[PDB]
């Protein structure tokens, strides 16, 4: 029972900049990830950028070294700094919440020479 | 109640590959990520793939174009192909469920010109 509420979106300029923010609320305790998708007109909704609880981050070919996502771990908000900003980042963007489970006991992989 | 068993690690030359497997049991209809980690000694337990229900894959900067992550819905097993594999890929590496939730209501961004 998590809520997302997505902000800060508008008209803005080719090659501009925007901030949108996703504030979370509800039981988010559990909650040790959180992405950023886009739905571009016509097509698949697509994960942009994502990030959890030890702060690692992970981007799409399409935007990596454009876009930043980071989060304010204090008001439960994530934020997803967008640069260079192109008429193909015309989208609906989407916050999602993820529960990210328990781990297998592993297997180990070892490289010679 | 998921339980994890991961195979496949073992003893590899340079720029040989190995392929993972990743068998999932319980209740795992809720399920609908998965991801793959990988522990090198000394260092924090690190993402390397995941994919979801739909999908949708990502993929670390070190092993995008040498790995590979697939799933086998009818089995609840994942895997993970790793190709081109360097001694900087020796670590224990771990399968990792998880279930992402809901979306928002969603912000609408239009760049213009
Ligand atoms: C990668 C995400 C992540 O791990 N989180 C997150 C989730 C959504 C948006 C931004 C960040 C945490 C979720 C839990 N909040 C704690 C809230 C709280 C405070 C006091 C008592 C009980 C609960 C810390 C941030
Ligand atoms: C991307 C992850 C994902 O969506 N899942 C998944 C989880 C782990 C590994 C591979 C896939 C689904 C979990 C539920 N199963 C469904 C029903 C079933 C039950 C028992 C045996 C076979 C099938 C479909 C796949």
């Known amino acids: 029972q998590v809520q997302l509420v997505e902000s800060g979106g508008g008209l803005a300029q080719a090659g501009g900049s925007l901030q949108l923010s996703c504030?979370?609320?509800?039981?988010?305790?559990?909650?040790?990830?959180?992405?950023?998708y886009r739905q571009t007109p016509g097509k698949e909704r697509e994960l942009?950028?994502?990030?959890?609880?030890?702060?690692?981050?992970?981007?799409?070919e399409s935007v990596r070294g454009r876009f930043t996502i980071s989060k304010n771990d204090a008001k439960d908000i994530v934020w997803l700094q967008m640069n260079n900003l192109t008429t193909e980042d015309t989208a609906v963007?989407?916050?999602?919440?993820?529960?990210?489970?328990?781990?297998?006991?592993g297997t180990q992989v070892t490289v010679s020479s | 109640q998921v339980q994890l068993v991961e195979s496949g690690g073992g003893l590899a030359q340079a720029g040989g590959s190995l392929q993972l497997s990743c068998a999932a049991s319980?209740?795992?209809?809720?399920?609908?990520?998965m991801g793959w980690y990988r522990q090198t000694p000394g260092k924090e337990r690190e993402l390397v793939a995941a994919?979801?229900?739909?999908?949708?894959?990502v993929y670390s900067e070190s092993v995008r174009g040498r790995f590979t992550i697939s799933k086998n819905d009818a089995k609840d097993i994942v895997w993970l192909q790793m190709n081109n594999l360097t001694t900087e890929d020796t670590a224990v590496y771990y399968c990792?469920?998880?279930?992402?939730?809901?979306w928002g209501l969603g912000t609408q961004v239009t760049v213009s010109s």
């Open positions: 990792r469920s998880g279930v992402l939730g809901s």
């Open positions: 994919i979801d229900r739909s999908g949708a894959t």
């Open positions: 319980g209740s795992t209809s809720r399920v609908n990520a």
